[PDB]
Amino acid sequence: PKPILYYDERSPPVRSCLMLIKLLDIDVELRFVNLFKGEQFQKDFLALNPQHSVPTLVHGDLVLTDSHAILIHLAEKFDEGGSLWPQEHAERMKVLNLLLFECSFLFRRASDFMSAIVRQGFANVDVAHHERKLTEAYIIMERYLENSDFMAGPQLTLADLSIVTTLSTVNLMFPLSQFPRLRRWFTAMQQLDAYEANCSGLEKLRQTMESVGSFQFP
Amino acid sequence: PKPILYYDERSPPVRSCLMLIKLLDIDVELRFVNLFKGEQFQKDFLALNPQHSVPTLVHGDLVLTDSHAILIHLAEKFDEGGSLWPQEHAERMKVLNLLLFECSFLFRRASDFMSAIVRQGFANVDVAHHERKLTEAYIIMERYLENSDFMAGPQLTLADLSIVTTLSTVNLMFPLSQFPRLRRWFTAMQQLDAYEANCSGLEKLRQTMESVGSFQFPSSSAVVT
């Protein structure tokens, strides 16, 4: 059976998988789960994924509930011998390391910020606090780009697909003008054919956040 | 060359790597970084790992800055063909899925809770809020263990090593009375010879948190075997 992707394109990790699917021409069945209507708490989805999160991939009997596992799985199954998920161990571990940075550092802080807006309202969020936390992530990625054109080396990898969607989401609020390597990389990422898979969900998140948060991004 | 592990044993992710090293009898050079004294912000360590986090592994030219990558790299180099990081693709993806659960959900919430204690003092923390968010992680792990004997399947894997350390950390505060599968699984993990590598740093984290947070964990919560 072809893979089934439960998704809401406002989620940046969803968009990372949509970019990989477009990049590799994967035939996938999309199933929309509206996160802002709480559809991730519907009994059948909770039974499928008790973490009530998207993306969720069902591929045969395999149920994956984290975008980084989905990216790796789809690359191994549909891009064997490719460069997005390098076959050499040291290069593959460097891509793994940056995928985990995205999960544990960049996305955690992006989620902390966006969730604060939803819960407290934009007017009541400590914006300076989150600006510092996310600017630190900008600084780290700027250092990661010192020796290489991409996040994990000289070529595009799953690490770039995972990072770019969250960064574009944080970039809604905090510009990249003070980070030259990072701004050039982000501009280069926007030139990919596959980057088109990010545009629609980013704009939907922009307008959903502005309405729910009762504000407007700069 | 031999792997270098920058560590603070109070970190649950550090203890996860310490358990794998003991389970596999890997010779590693331990280099201590005191998280509570702020040695992770020293110039030399920041240059090596700008995320200023432990565990950090240096193995030859490879520098890993996340425990889950470290567990996978060590399993592939010292448990080739083993069952901790299984060779069959579907089983391996299941282990990876649970490692990312630990990173994105259990550890995220456990760190939110401990961080608040350190920053505000226990008496100013909204403990009920964190009790809810961590009980939800308990429920999810209980669900995983209803369908399988270990976290990712019928055998011990890297997912159990990653999860048990943060679980033991959360369980300093929140009891497991209502979670029989989690209790049975935790009890089994504590019988493992490798679990000795978790014991010491758990206790030191208990002592440090009580001091910095100006409180005491309820002694009745922690599961002891």
Numbering used by the authors:
A (entry chain BA): 4 to 221
B (entry chain AA): 4 to 228
Give sentences from the paper.
The importance of the Asp-113–EST hydrogen bond for EST binding was biochemically examined with a recombinant mutated DmNobo protein carrying D113A amino acid substitution (DmNobo D113A). DmNobo D113A lacks the sidechain carboxyl group at position 113 and therefore cannot form a hydrogen bond with EST. The crystal structure of the DmNobo D113A did not show significant structural differences compared with the WT DmNobo (DmNobo WT) protein. In the absence of EST, both DmNobo WT and DmNobo D113A showed GSH conjugation activity although the activity of DmNobo D113A decreased by approximately half of DmNobo WT. In the presence of EST, as expected from the EST-binding to the H-site, the enzymatic activity of DmNobo WT was inhibited with an IC50 value of ∼2.3 μm. In contrast, the enzymatic activity of DmNobo D113A was not inhibited by EST, even at a concentration of 25 μm. In contrast, it was barely possible to determine the Kd value between DmNobo D113A and EST because of a weak interaction, which was consistent with crystal structure analysis.
